[PDB]
């Protein structure tokens, strides 16, 4: 916690101008996606899905 | 899902622990039906006996 | 529940006549 | 009262996505609304009710035959004792109304004051004898602020597609207006608050502080 005006006013500016910066694509960010998607978890968790799912038929 | 399962098996134990505390109330009042007969009759033979004697 | 308190209400007025009961001991 | 606790327990997740092009969103919601309805019977059967002990080493008493004649036993748990004594209170129909007491009553509590509060009744009646759930709420609550953080982004570049010129114009006065909010505290530092080289408004300051 312990949040304070600067500390608030410079995050509104960080989250303002990763997304700008992004519109203008000066900014890569794949160390970033490559913890949702692209990691086994949307994989691995299907494959629990898929066991979970005929768990409950019996 | 998961945290689902984990709440679920809380019920699987709770119905066990629900039909576990209905066992106890028919072989707990049926010992104190039981024990109203007995006493019923007792106090019949006793109120006799008493009325026997002189004293009623 | 029904039958436990016509357990207690017939057995605490059972002691207040076995009293009264023994107090009559000059017979 | 609840405590205060140093990390967020629930978040909101939100529903401003498109609901024709992310799916099973609904899912989410019936499945938490379901674990919602999966704890009200939790709760509900912890505060259980029993009733196992009407009247059924120190949880046996051995009452005194004073006493033996308002319970109709002469030992059992101080519970059955002061239930059935409440109860012959209570038969007897003692309670004003309109304790006063009985006749009986006057040997067992040793008092003709034929007159009591039910206080001192039941004061001469003892006077004769779990971890791994707070983990998965904070992961929980640790994925729905990553949603609700995604979900920004999303609602900030939808909302740059429709009206571009209204949101471009937002972001640059934004930045002119933040830019300038933390610029300043950078004049008080300690080490460029005693060379003299900010003291030469630092000076119409000292004018309102004096005639103050």
Same mark, same amino acid.
């Given at each position: 916690?312990?949040?304070?005006?600067?500390?608030?006013?410079?995050?509104?500016?960080?989250?303002?101008?990763?997304?700008?910066?992004?519109?203008?694509?000066?900014?890569?960010?794949?160390?970033?996606?490559?913890?949702?998607?692209?990691?086994?978890?949307?994989?691995?968790?299907?494959?629990?899905?898929?066991?979970?799912?005929?768990?409950?038929?019996? | 899902?998961?945290?689902?399962?984990?709440?679920?098996?809380?019920?699987?134990?709770?119905?066990?622990?629900?039909?576990?505390?209905?066992?106890?109330?028919?072989?707990?009042?049926?010992?104190?039906?039981?024990?109203?007969?007995?006493?019923?009759?007792?106090?019949?033979?006793?109120?006799?006996?008493?009325?026997?004697?002189?004293?009623? | 529940?029904?039958?436990?308190?016509?357990?207690?209400?017939?057995?605490?007025?059972?002691?207040?006549?076995?009293?009264?009961?023994?107090?009559?001991?000059?017979? | 009262?609840?405590?205060?606790?140093?990390?967020?327990?629930?978040?909101?997740?939100?529903?401003?996505?498109?609901?024709?092009?992310?799916?099973?969103?609904?899912?989410?919601?019936?499945?938490?609304?379901?674990?919602?309805?999966?704890?009200?019977?939790?709760?509900?059967?912890?505060?259980?009710?029993?009733?196992?002990?009407?009247?059924?080493?120190?949880?046996?008493?051995?009452?005194?035959?004073?006493?033996?004649?308002?319970?109709?036993?002469?030992?059992?748990?101080?519970?059955?004792?002061?239930?059935?004594?409440?109860?012959?209170?209570?038969?007897?129909?003692? +309670?004003?109304?309109?304790?006063?007491?009985?006749?009986?009553?006057?040997?067992?509590?040793?008092?003709?004051?034929?007159?009591?509060?039910?206080?001192?009744?039941?004061? @001469?009646?003892?006077?004769?004898?779990?971890?791994?759930?707070?983990?998965?709420?904070?992961?929980? @609550?640790?994925?729905?602020?990553?949603?609700?953080?995604?979900?920004?982004?999303?609602?900030? +570049?939808?909302?740059?597609?429709?009206?571009?010129?209204?949101?471009?114009?937002?972001?640059?006065?934004?930045?002119?207006?933040?830019?300038?909010?933390?610029?300043?505290?950078?004049? +008080?530092?300690?080490?460029?608050?005693?060379?003299?080289?900010?003291?030469?408004?630092?000076?119409?300051?000292?004018?309102?502080?004096?005639?103050?």
């Amino acid at each position: 916690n312990n949040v304070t005006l600067k500390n608030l006013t410079a995050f509104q500016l960080l989250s303002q101008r990763e997304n700008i910066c992004e519109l203008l694509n000066l900014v890569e960010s794949t160390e970033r996606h490559n913890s949702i998607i692209n990691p086994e978890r949307q994989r691995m968790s299907l494959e629990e899905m898929k066991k979970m799912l005929d768990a409950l038929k019996n | 899902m998961e945290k689902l399962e984990s709440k679920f098996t809380k019920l699987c134990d709770l119905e066990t622990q629900l039909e576990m505390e209905k066992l106890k109330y028919v072989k707990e009042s049926e010992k104190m039906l039981n024990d109203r007969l007995s006493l019923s009759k007792q106090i019949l033979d006793l109120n006799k006996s008493l009325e026997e004697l002189n004293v009623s | 529940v029904k039958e436990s308190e016509k357990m207690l209400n017939d057995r605490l007025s059972l002691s207040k006549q076995i009293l009264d009961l023994n107090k009559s001991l000059e017979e | 009262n609840p405590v205060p606790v140093t990390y967020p327990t629930d978040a909101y997740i939100p529903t401003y996505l498109p609901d024709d092009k992310v799916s099973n969103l609904a899912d989410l919601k019936k499945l938490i609304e379901m674990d919602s309805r999966l704890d009200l019977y939790l709760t509900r059967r912890r505060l259980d009710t029993s009733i196992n002990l009407p009247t059924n080493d120190g949880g046996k008493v051995q009452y005194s035959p004073n006493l033996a004649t308002l319970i109709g036993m002469q030992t059992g748990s101080v519970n059955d004792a002061v239930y059935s004594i409440y109860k012959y209170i209570l038969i007897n129909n003692l +309670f004003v109304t309109e304790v006063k007491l009985d006749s009986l009553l006057q040997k067992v509590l040793d008092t003709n004051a034929a007159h009591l509060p039910l206080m001192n009744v039941v004061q @001469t009646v003892n006077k004769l004898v779990d971890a791994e759930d707070t983990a998965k709420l904070r992961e929980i @609550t640790k994925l729905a602020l990553q949603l609700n953080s995604s979900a920004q982004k999303y609602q900030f +570049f939808h909302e740059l597609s429709l009206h571009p010129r209204e949101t471009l114009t937002h972001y640059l006065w934004s930045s002119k207006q933040n830019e300038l909010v933390l610029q300043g505290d950078q004049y +008080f530092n300690e080490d460029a608050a005693r060379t003299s080289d900010i003291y030469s408004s630092l000076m119409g300051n000292i004018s309102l502080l004096y005639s103050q």
